[PDB]
TrEMBL record, chain B:
<protein>
    <recommendedName>
        <fullName>Nuclear receptor coactivator</fullName>
    </recommendedName>
</protein>
<comment type="similarity">
    <text>Belongs to the SRC/p160 nuclear receptor coactivator family.</text>
</comment>
<comment type="function">
    <text>Nuclear receptor coactivator that directly binds nuclear receptors and stimulates the transcriptional activities in a hormone-dependent fashion. Involved in the coactivation of different nuclear receptors, such as for steroids (PGR, GR and ER), retinoids (RXRs), thyroid hormone (TRs) and prostanoids (PPARs). Also involved in coactivation mediated by STAT3, STAT5A, STAT5B and STAT6 transcription factors. Displays histone acetyltransferase activity toward H3 and H4; the relevance of such activity remains however unclear.</text>
</comment>
Amino acid sequence: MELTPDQQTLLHFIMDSYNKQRMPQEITNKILKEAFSAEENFLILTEMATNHVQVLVEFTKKLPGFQTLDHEDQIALLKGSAVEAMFLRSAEIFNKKLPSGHSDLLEARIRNSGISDEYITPMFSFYKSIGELKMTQEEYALLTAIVILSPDRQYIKDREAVEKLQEPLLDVLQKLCKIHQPENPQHFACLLGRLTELRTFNHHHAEMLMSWRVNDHKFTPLLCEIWDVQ
Amino acid sequence: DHQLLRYLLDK
Ligand SMILES: O=C(NC1CCCCC1)[C@H](C1CCCCC1)n1c(-c2ccc(CO)cc2)nc2ccccc21
């Protein structure tokens, strides 16, 4: 049941690499302190997402065996997972415990941030459903690595090479799930099930961004090639 | 094409 020394080494390596991200406190404190216009909030998201993509590329290239992959499959994996990794990270941040009434204010601030009503509902249903999993930082880190190293992404030339890389991470996560939550033996299945919901956000993402109640939808050149926006 | 992502990956 317990982790092998290789798995323990793998877990800690993924964990350190994952912690190079912007602190959940830095994001929440920024939007909780002041109420912003849709224009300022669009600009906050665009800055947040550019930093996120940058740190995501660095996290991804530290994933074991990632640098041994074909360079075209490398791009495909990063483009394929970037939106999902972003919503999983927002879901992580959203569900961090804050003082009384703070999580309620954060939610109300995202709700009136500037996004269309139609996208708020599936986004908050996904966040609340991730919270019901009571995920550890380790679980968030591994699931992000699993999302990145998805062999069933579009335009992947060598699925098997990606499969061989994702399999040790799935093994670790499963060992963790059966350790922390023996009470819920279906916890691992529930985690993998959320991944199929993340995929839906990817499909309607460009529409989500253009639907923001701003006059100009200006993105950074990096977000432009990652999100396929103009 | 995606030269920014390519640049970040190849550094
Ligand atoms: O900053 C943010 N996200 C970043 C993204 C990169 C990784 C870290 C989080 C934003 C905005 C919140 C409203 C004010 C402006 C930023 N956000 C969203 C969110 C809202 C809309 C979309 C698509 O339109 C995507 C994500 N969910 C959040 C849940 C918790 C805390 C921030 C959250």
